Every structure is written in structure tokens, then in C-alpha cells.
Design an enzyme around this catalytic site. Structure first.
Site, PDB file in Angstrom:
ATOM      1  N   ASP A  73     -14.328  -3.612   4.576  1.00  0.00           N
ATOM      2  CA  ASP A  73     -13.885  -2.941   3.362  1.00  0.00           C
ATOM      3  C   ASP A  73     -15.065  -2.604   2.461  1.00  0.00           C
ATOM      4  O   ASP A  73     -15.141  -1.501   1.911  1.00  0.00           O
ATOM      5  CB  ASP A  73     -12.857  -3.798   2.629  1.00  0.00           C
ATOM      6  CG  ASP A  73     -12.348  -3.134   1.373  1.00  0.00           C
ATOM      7  OD1 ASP A  73     -11.678  -2.086   1.487  1.00  0.00           O
ATOM      8  OD2 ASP A  73     -12.621  -3.656   0.272  1.00  0.00           O
ATOM      9  N   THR A 114      -3.554   8.079  -4.335  1.00  0.00           N
ATOM     10  CA  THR A 114      -2.492   8.394  -3.390  1.00  0.00           C
ATOM     11  C   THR A 114      -1.173   7.728  -3.748  1.00  0.00           C
ATOM     12  O   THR A 114      -0.186   8.412  -4.037  1.00  0.00           O
ATOM     13  CB  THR A 114      -2.909   7.951  -1.990  1.00  0.00           C
ATOM     14  OG1 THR A 114      -3.099   6.531  -1.985  1.00  0.00           O
ATOM     15  CG2 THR A 114      -4.214   8.595  -1.620  1.00  0.00           C
ATOM     16  N   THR A 115      -1.138   6.394  -3.706  1.00  0.00           N
ATOM     17  CA  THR A 115       0.046   5.667  -4.146  1.00  0.00           C
ATOM     18  C   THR A 115       0.382   6.000  -5.597  1.00  0.00           C
ATOM     19  O   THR A 115       1.530   5.847  -6.030  1.00  0.00           O
ATOM     20  CB  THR A 115      -0.181   4.160  -3.957  1.00  0.00           C
ATOM     21  OG1 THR A 115       1.021   3.441  -4.245  1.00  0.00           O
ATOM     22  CG2 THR A 115      -1.294   3.660  -4.861  1.00  0.00           C
ATOM     23  N   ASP A 142       0.819  -1.213   0.000  1.00  0.00           N
ATOM     24  CA  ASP A 142       0.000   0.000   0.000  1.00  0.00           C
ATOM     25  C   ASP A 142       0.853   1.263   0.000  1.00  0.00           C
ATOM     26  O   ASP A 142       1.080   1.863   1.052  1.00  0.00           O
ATOM     27  CB  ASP A 142      -0.958   0.014   1.198  1.00  0.00           C
ATOM     28  CG  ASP A 142      -1.902   1.203   1.186  1.00  0.00           C
ATOM     29  OD1 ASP A 142      -1.914   1.965   0.196  1.00  0.00           O
ATOM     30  OD2 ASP A 142      -2.630   1.379   2.184  1.00  0.00           O
TER      31      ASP A 142
END
Lengths: 509, 521
Positions: free
Chosen positions: B382, B78-79, B45
Site C-alpha cells: 500500500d 470514488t466512494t 470500500d
């Protein structure tokens, strides 16, 4: 920091170099590894246990392999070899070829179904053992003590370790899992007979509780386990200021001893002649015990009373108010202070939450006692595993080849990409038939193909190579038992582990 | 230095941007992160690792920061926004080296960063609802590691994903609304797994206190206690003095009795039910059962505070004026329509049915064994995380991946139209767009061009629509490099999530694009 093959081939450089001598170190013909200590010393190890500890880290993935050898040591204490064997045995073949097929991934789900076909193969070959009959276990339980082999107490301690995890099996989670061991504990006994190394209920306390004044025995009177504040409290439940004045001094001591009083108003009602105070133990507090005609017990700790909570079955008192019997020294109780050798042994039998039972192990000396203590381990561990999993499976190439062609058959059943890991994982099984023969000194090749042929006829159902006879044979014949417990537990671990370091294509900081 | 350090500004990015490309979100492989030197940590992640990673260079400095700046706003883009700067830093890499002052193309990248969102603007879906996000069942089917729940990646995914979507649900303090407040849902292994269903109320994880504590309580005044009921060591009661012995019994009798008096003041002050995440000794607890009141123990912090929110008014979970030797101050009054202590999912637990201040509903996911409760856990949480953002953001673009292939062509069309170098600026921004589907070819092991070029091969005009995954773009897969109509499984993206990374991705480079050296003078 590593990446790509440098991780992957480095992963191969991690567990395999670990698992290289380990296969010689494994099998019933296990060949120890020589070690060279930083002092200039030597340690001879068949263990996958001792090697990783001493040997310095040869790769970051090895640091991960170390812990799955720990995890299996945590889970059992044996199979630590095979988990780093099997997983590292998976690492050499599949990945790079399948990174040339471009994936860690297809290998993972392959490893997962490389896992299940064995789990599919096992239930036949892994077949229920009867935990009722001791010998039906003891054949597994002799199979546990036979390789590590301290032979004299590999005889008795098994029946002891049989009874150990048996007598410590009530285990109630509602699901009746048997992981239950800790209640079964050895006892370090100076002097005495080499026999009467045996299982007794509760915990006879060999650790910190040894006293000239417990009297010599307290049977019906209670053993009282204080978490709570046997020392005075200057206020009601609390403490107030010290003495700067004539006015303050007299005010302080009243509620101080009155707390010790109101403790031992409610503490004395439950009839100890021995109060074991792990905390709140202090001179005036134990001097009060000295003055209360209740034994002052010092140099004693939580493990002790948690073992005494495991011994008579007490609950170490968390309430400063209102101590009682079932708090401490449950049942009529037995606190038996026996010197077998010069150590006063606190024997607390009569366990409540019963089936929590230690193991009284008495040699004529600590070694011949430790000889009982070590043989007890694999037995009681596998006993635990047999009591956990009431099944057994033929050892050696039986589980290896029966799953090997299975995975191969499954690989042919798939005839896909993941077949290639199945092709790689099936061979991971067969390094053990190698390993078993790579010990004895014959040519495993002739036998491998013959064990292939043992599968060609019998699917290597019960037929493995037995390491010490080095030949391809029924293990239900030989009574050589890996359980579905010990093996699948060991196999489960490495299945995840090879995935783990294969889930690593990049090592970073 | 110079273009060298400017490359070192690009290199250190793409260097570390590998680890966020090679580990892309959850499907990214585990990456061993050495904490400092000798302590290694296996994780993934890239939105996370960069923080456990310890940045060497001022280039990756902002990357861990901007990825977090993206991550602080929302957990996606983001990543990636790590790479996309470097990906643009690769686009303008030789440009700056060619003839190009990037000031030209970067302001063109801006208008490109702008023009592009105007598709993301026109790219939305109002009802993704039976379509879900990342399909619907595949909100959980992704959230489920699939063993016994695998085909239930349809069944229980029609449950837990439809749960957050549609069940009667109480937000913080008894609030019906589309939850951003998640949902109380539990897991209990046993019985038949398919029997996992909703309960009407909060599903408690609680130590049941019914010894003769009344199980069913109508109009139940609830005391949810994070402060325990303990007990207090107490000295002599009324007076001190003993002329005859029975006083010493009564003097030490009011230890229990004053609380017996005060716990039937707890009837008077109030509650019909005492939920305690802390401890209740049966000393206190019995006082309630002889008071005819409910006292429940170690009600799950979540579950209890979930009750302690919906239960209404004041609650001891967030408050203590109570000793527990003490009577209540009625800061403990929560309210339940009825408490029927209920047998559910191999559990006898107090189940607080609806609320006085609300109607609570909690699913319990019955594990065939723990492994369901282990794997549905993520499916619980999730797929919860998914629909919450879906309910949080109901303006969400159709398609994740094939958007970029469009956004390439969508913008690459706007490229050739503008003219001059800003025509070139727009085209080089339409390039960097295509790495996000290509870092899907990382984890899914797909073929980047055969992935992405064939993604771009999909169009009539430029558009990403659940209408057409072939005649135009839509969706994309962690399962393939293949666009999909979003309800089967297309990858949905939330609209607010996209423009951010879009915005931010160019905002890391341009300053790095300005800095002309790193070193001393």
C-alpha cells in the site's frame, strides 16, 4: 439488509441466541440441547458443532458466527462453543452503550487490548507442559477425553493419540510448528481384538485397496503408485489415429504396448509385485499387470496413493518416463495385505519421510473401534495442540477471573473509554464461571463474588470454578488443563469475531 | 412520482450513499453484502461494494458507474462521488422544490465546480517527498497494521515509503525512473526485523537449483522461464535393433543424452542462469550443473518476471520456442551483471545482483515473525501504491480535508460576490464540499460540525497550506477531525484525483436533475 443497532442488536440476536443453550451445553457438566428435526426427529447436543448445522440461520451475523465456530472446528474441533460464546458474549454489553458513546472503533482496539491482557495473563497461568512425558501430556490429554467421555477408550486411545501426533511429529517447516495430524489417521478394521488399536508408521490403506490378488502379502517387492498412464499410448509418449485400414492397424499396437512396455521396462526395474494404479488403470493396462506377474490394483485413487505416498513414503509418479523405487514404494518397503475381519487391509509400513504414521485402530467391531476412533480425536487434537504449544493453563474461572480483573484492572489502568469494553470483556470471561455453575445448580453469584474474592486473594491464578465440582479451586491441583494452545486459539478467534460483526454496522445486499 | 421519483432519484442514492459514507474507503466499517439473496459477503470500500452490490434503481445505476468511472481514472474520489451527487442532490433538493429551476443553480454549480478547482489548481506541492503523501512514514504507518512494525511505522516507513521514493529501481525492462512500475520488495520472517533492508538486485522467491550448479556467476546470461523445463517421455533412441544387450542401454541412454547434448548446446545457444517459474526437473537441472550453468526453479512469477524484464533482451517467461528437452533458441537470454547466489533474510536464494541491462534493487522485509511479513505486506504494497501515484502524479494538492472547508469558504466567498441566484448557486455548491470531512467523522467517530465547522474556523484568508494548519487550512486526519501540517500527518490529495470527482460529482446529478419522471407513458 440491516443498519446501526439493527445490525448491532441483531448481532446480539445472532451469536447469543446461539450461545444461550451452548453454555449449558458447555463445561464438564455440559447439558445437551434438544433439537427438533425437520422430519420430526431429535438430536441431543452438548455440541456447538451440531447445533449451528441443523438450526436454521437466525441472523446474517450468525452465518458469520457459524464460520468462526467452523474456523475453530477447522483449527481444533473444540472451542466452537466458546468462540461463538465469547464473541457473542462480547456483543451484548459494549456496543450499544458504546454506540451511545458513538463508536464501533474504540471497542475494536479495546477488544485488541482486551485480547492482549489475557495473552499477558496467560503466560504466567499458561505454563509449559512437558511434551516429553506422556502423562504430563496425558493429564491434558485426559482433560481432553474427560468431558466428551467414552471412558474405556478414553484410556488407551489417548496413549495412542499421544503416540499418534507424537509419531506423526517430525514436523519440519524449519520452525518446528506441530499442526501435524493428517499423517495420523484412524483405521476402520472389521473383527479383530479390541486392543492393538495403536499407531503404526505410514498409512495402512483401509480405503479403496482390498484385493484377493495382491497375492496375500508383498513385502520386499514394491507398491507402485501410478498417476501415470499405465494404459497404452499409441505414439511415442502420445497417441495416433484409429483403424480405418489394414495399413494403420499394425502400426498402432506397436507403440501402444511398447509404451506400456517402456513404462514397465522402467516400472518393472524397481521390483513391484504390486503396482497400484490410480490413473492409467484400465483392463488392458491391469491385464498387463495380470500378465506382468505384478498385481493389478484397480478401484484405487489418489487419496490411496497419497496415503501410500504417506505410507511407504512414495512419490506418486508424475513422470511416464523412468519410474524407480523412491518414486513408488520407498525403502525396501512393506505392503502387508492382512484380513483382520474380511477386508484385505493394505498395510504399507516402512515410511520414508518418516514420522508420517497412521493409527491402526482395531475393535472387535466398528463401534468399539469407533469408540477408539472418537476418543482418539480430542486427545490427538489436543496432543497436536500440546505438541504445537508445549504449554498448559488452569481451566475454568482461573483463566476467566485472572484475566477478568486484569482487564478490569487494565480498564482501571486505562480509566478511559476502552475501559468499558474491558469492563464488558472481563465479564465475558465470567459467564463461564456462571456457565460452570449454571450447570451444577448452585448460585454462581455467591461464587462469582467469591471468585472475585478468589482473585482478591490469589488473582485466580490457578483457581477457577471446576464445572463438575462446581467450586472455586486450583486447576493445577485438579490437573484440569486448557492449553495456551486450545484456549488462546479459541480466545483468539472470538476476539476477532466480535470485532467482525461489530465491524458490521450495516448489513446490505 | 415527479419530485417523488426525483426524490427517489435522490433517496436511492443517499440510501446506498450511506453504505459508501458509512463505509468510507479502508477505514469504513466492514459491510455485509448479500451477493443476491441468500449469499452474504462481508466487505467495505464503497469503490468496490457497489459492484458487488446489485443496483436496484436507475439513480444508483450511474452511481456505481460514475464511482467506477472515477475509479477507472483513479482509485480515490470514488466512494465519495457517490455521495456528492446525492449531497448536491440534497443541496438542490428543496431548491428544485422551492422556486428554483436547477438549470440556474446547476450551471452555477458548474462555475462553482469550475471556480473551485482553480484553488485546487493553485493548490499543489512539487516536493512532497520527505513529506510523503498522507505524511511520509504515514504512507506506511497507514499501510502498516501496527504490532511489531508499529514504531517502525516510522523506521520501516522511512524504508518502504522511501523505497518507492528513493531506491535505484528498474521499471519494466530494466528502466531507471520514478516507478509507476512499483518496486520488487519481498518479506522473509526471521532474524531481527529491524535488519530488513534493501538488496542490490531483484530479491527472488525461487527454489534454488545449486547442487553444484555454480552459485556465483559473473556476467550471468539469465533465462527466466515461465515455460517449465519438464521432461519428455521418450521411446527408443538410435535405431531400434538389439543384437547384443548394451545397445538397449545406449538406445534408452540418449533419452538423457540428447538433452545433455542440447543443454550444453544451451551453453552454446545461451544462458549462464536458468530461472524457471515453472518446473525444472533435476534431470534438466543437472545437465546445466554439469554444463557449469545456473538453473533455478519456481522463481516467483512477479520476482522472475521482474528479473525477466530487467534481465534484458529475450526471455522464456513471455516466450516459448524451447521444449526443455530441446536446446535453447536464445529467446532465453536475459543478462545479469553478476549472479551471486546470496544468503539473505533467513533465505538462501539466488539473488541476481543488479543487471547487465540495469541496476536492480529489492528490499526484503524481515519478519520478526510472519506477522510483520503479514502486516508489512500491506506496508510493502500500500505504501507502494501511495508513492507510485505520488511518483505518477507529482502535482498534488496540499491537504485533503481542510481543502473542502476552505473550498467551502473559498467558494462561499466567490458565492456572495457573484450575485443573483448564481450567488446562491455557488453557496449551495460550497455546502456539498463539507461531507467528505464529515464522512471522516463517520469512521473516526468525530463530531461533524466540530470537525467541519472548526475546519472552516481556520483561516486568515482562504487557503490550505502546510504552512498553517491553524492560521489557515491544511491536512486532515483519519485519526481526528483535525487539520494537520501535511508532513506530520496531513492528508494529501493528488491534484488530478480531485478535479475528477469535483467534475464528476455534479455530472451525475444534472442529468438525474433533468429527468422529470421514471415511468411509462
Amino acid at each position: 439488509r440491516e443498519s446501526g443497532r439493527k445490525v448491532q442488536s441483531g448481532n446480539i440476536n445472532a451469536a447469543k441466541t446461539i450461545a444461550d443453550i451452548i453454555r449449558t451445553c458447555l463445561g464438564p457438566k455440559s447439558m445437551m440441547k434438544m433439537l427438533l428435526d425437520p422430519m420430526g426427529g431429535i438430536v441431543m447436543t452438548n455440541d456447538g458443532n451440531a447445533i449451528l448445522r441443523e438450526i436454521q440461520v437466525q441472523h446474517p451475523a450468525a452465518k458469520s458466527m457459524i464460520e468462526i465456530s467452523r474456523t475453530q472446528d477447522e483449527e481444533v474441533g473444540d472451542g466452537t462453543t466458546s468462540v461463538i460464546i465469547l464473541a457473542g458474549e462480547m456483543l451484548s454489553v459494549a456496543e450499544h452503550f458504546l454506540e451511545q458513546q458513538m463508536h464501533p472503533t474504540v471497542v475494536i482496539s479495546a477488544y485488541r487490548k482486551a485480547l492482549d491482557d489475557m495473552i499477558s495473563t496467560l503466560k504466567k497461568i499458561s505454563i509449559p507442559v512437558d511434551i516429553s512425558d506422556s502423562d504430563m501430556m496425558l493429564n491434558i490429554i485426559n482433560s481432553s477425553i474427560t468431558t466428551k467421555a467414552i471412558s474405556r477408550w478414553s484410556s488407551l486411545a489417548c496413549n495412542i493419540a499421544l503416540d499418534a501426533v507424537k509419531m506423526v511429529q517430525f514436523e519440519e517447516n524449519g520452525r518446528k510448528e506441530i499442526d501435524i495430524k493428517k499423517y495420523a489417521r484412524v483405521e476402520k478394521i472389521p473383527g479383530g481384538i479390541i486392543e492393538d488399536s495403536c499407531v503404526l508408521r505410514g498409512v495402512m490403506i483401509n480405503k479403496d485397496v482390498t484385493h484377493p490378488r495382491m497375492r496375500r502379502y508383498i513385502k520386499n517387492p514394491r507398491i507402485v503408485l501410478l498417476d501415470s498412464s499405465l494404459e497404452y499410448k499409441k505414439g511415442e509418449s502420445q497417441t495416433d489415429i484409429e483403424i480405418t485400414r489394414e495399413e494403420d492397424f499394425t502400426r498402432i499396437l506397436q507403440m501402444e504396448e511398447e509404451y506400456i512396455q517402456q513404462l514397465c521396462e522402467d516400472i518393472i526395474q524397481l521390483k513391484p509385485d504390486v503396482v497400484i494404479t490410480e490413473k492409467g488403470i484400465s483392463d488392458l493396462a491391469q491385464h498387463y499387470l495380470m500378465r506382468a506377474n505384478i498385481t493389478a490394483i484397480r478401484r484405487v485413487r489418489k487419496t490411496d496413493n497419497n496415503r501410500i505416498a504417506r505410507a511407504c513414503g512414495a512419490r506418486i509418479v508424475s513422470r511416464p518416463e523412468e519410474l524407480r523405487e523412491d518414486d513408488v514404494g520407498t525403502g525396501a518397503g512393506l505392503l502387508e495385505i492382512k484380513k483382520i475381519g474380511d477386508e484385505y487391509f493394505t498395510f504399507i509400513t516402512d515410511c520414508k519421510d518418516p514420522k508420517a504414521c497412521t493409527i491402526l485402530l482395531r475393535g472387535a467391531s466398528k463401534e468399539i473401534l469407533s469408540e477408539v476412533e472418537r476418543n482418539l480425536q480430542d486427545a490427538m487434537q489436543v496432543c497436536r495442540n500440546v505438541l504445537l504449544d508445549p504449554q498448559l493453563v488452569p481451566g475454568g474461572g482461573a483463566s476467566e477471573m485472572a484475566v477478568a480483573h486484569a482487564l478490569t484492572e487494565k480498564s482501571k489502568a486505562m480509566t478511559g473509554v476502552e475501559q468499558w469494553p474491558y469492563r464488558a470483556v472481563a465479564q465475558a470471561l465470567e459467564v463461564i464461571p456462571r456457565t460452570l455453575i449454571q450447570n451444577c445448580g448452585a448460585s454462581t453469584i455467591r461464587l462469582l463474588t467469591s471468585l472475585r474474592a478468589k482473585h482478591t486473594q490469589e488473582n485466580c491464578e490457578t483457581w477457577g470454578v471446576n464445572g463438575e465440582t462446581g467450586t472455586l479451586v486450583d486447576m493445577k491441583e485438579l490437573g484440569i488443563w486448557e492449553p495456551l494452545a486450545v484456549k488462546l486459539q479459541t480466545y483468539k478467534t472470538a476476539v476477532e469475531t466480535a470485532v467482525l460483526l461489530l465491524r458490521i454496522d450495516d448489513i446490505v445486499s | 412520482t415527479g419530485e417523488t421519483i426525483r426524490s427517489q432519484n435522490v433517496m436511492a442514492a443517499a440510501s446506498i450513499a450511506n453504505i459508501v459514507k458509512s463505509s468510507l474507503g479502508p477505514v469504513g466499517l466492514d459491510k455485509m453484502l448479500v451477493d443476491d439473496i441468500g449469499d452474504v459477503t462481508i466487505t467495505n470500500d464503497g469503490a468496490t461494494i457497489l459492484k458487488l452490490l446489485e443496483v436496484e434503481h436507475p439513480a444508483a445505476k450511474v452511481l456505481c458507474e460514475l464511482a467506477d468511472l472515477q475509479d477507472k481514472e483513479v482509485g480515490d474520489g470514488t466512494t465519495s462521488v457517490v455521495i456528492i451527487a446525492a449531497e448536491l442532490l440534497k443541496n438542490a433538493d428543496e431548491l428544485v422544490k422551492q422556486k428554483i429551476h436547477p438549470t440556474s443553480v446547476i450551471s452555477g454549480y458548474r462555475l462553482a465546480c469550475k471556480e473551485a478547482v482553480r484553488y485546487i489548481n493553485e493548490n499543489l506541492i512539487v516536493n512532497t517527498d520527505e513529506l510523503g503523501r498522507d505524511c511520509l512514514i504515514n504512507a506506511a504507518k497507514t499501510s502498516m497494521s501496527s504490532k511489531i512494525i508499529g514504531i517502525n511505522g516510522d523506521f520501516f516507513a522511512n524504508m518502504v515509503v522511501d523505497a518507492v521514493l528513493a531506491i535505484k529501481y528498474t521499471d519494466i525492462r530494466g528502466q531507471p525512473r520514478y516507478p509507476v512500475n512499483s518496486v520488487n520488495i519481498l518479506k522473509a520472517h526471521g532474524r531481527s526485523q529491524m535488519e530488513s533492508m534493501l538488496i542490490s538486485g531483484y530479491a527472488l522467491n525461487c527454489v534454488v537449483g545449486s547442487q553444484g550448479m555454480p552459485k556465483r556467476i559473473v556476467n550471468a546470461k539469465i533465462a527466466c522461464l515461465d515455460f517449465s523445463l519438464q521432461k519428455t517421455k521418450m521411446k527408443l533412441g538410435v535405431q531400434v535393433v538389439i543384437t547384443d544387450p548394451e545397445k538397449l542401454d545406449q538406445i534408452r541412454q540418449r533419452e538423457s543424452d540428447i538433452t545433455k547434448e542440447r543443454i550444453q548446446k544451451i551453453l552454446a545457444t545461451g544462458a549462464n542462469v536458468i530461472l524457471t517459474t515453472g518446473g525444472i526437473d533435476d534431470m534438466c537441472l543437472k545437465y546445466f550443473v554439469e554444463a557449469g550453468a545456473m538453473a533455478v526453479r519456481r522463481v516467483l512469477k512477479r520476482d522472475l518476471k521482474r528479473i525477466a524484464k530487467a534481465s534484458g533482451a529475450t526471455i522464456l517467461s513471455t516466450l516459448a520456442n524451447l521444449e526443455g528437452e530441446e536446446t535453447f533458441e536464445a529467446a532465453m537470454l536475459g543478462q545479469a551483471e553478476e549472479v551471486v547466489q546470496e544468503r539473505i533474510c533467513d533465505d538462501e536464494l539466488i539473488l541476481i545482483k543488479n543487471t547487465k541491462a540495469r541496476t536492480s534493487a529489492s528490499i526484503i522485509l524481515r519478519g520478526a515473525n510472519d506477522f510483520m511479513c503479514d502486516e508489512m505486506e500491506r506496508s510493502l504494497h500500500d505504501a507502494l501504491c501511495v508513492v507510485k501515484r505520488v511518483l505518477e502524479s507529482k502535482s498534488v494538492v496540499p491537504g485533503g480535508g481542510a481543502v473542502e472547508a476552505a473550498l467551502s469558504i473559498y467558494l462561499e466567498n466567490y458565492a456572495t460576490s457573484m450575485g443573483s441566484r448564481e450567488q446562491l448557486a455557488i453557496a449551495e455548491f460550497a455546502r456539498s464540499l463539507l461531507v467528505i470531512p464529515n464522512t471522516l467523522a463517520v469512521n473516526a467517530a468525530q463530531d461533524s460540525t466540530d470537525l467541519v465547522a472548526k475546519l472552516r474556523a481556520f483561516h486568515n484568508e482562504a487557503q490550505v497550506n502546510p504552512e498553517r494548519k491553524n492560521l489557515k487550512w491544511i491536512g486532515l486526519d483519519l485519526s481526528n477531525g483535525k487539520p494537520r501540517d501535511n508532513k506530520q500527518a496531513g492528508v494529501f490529495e493528488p491534484t488530478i484525483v480531485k478535479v475528477k470527482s469535483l467534475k464528476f460529482a455534479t455530472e451525475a446529478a444534472i442529468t438525474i436533475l433533468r429527468i422529470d419522471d421514471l415511468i411509462k407513458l
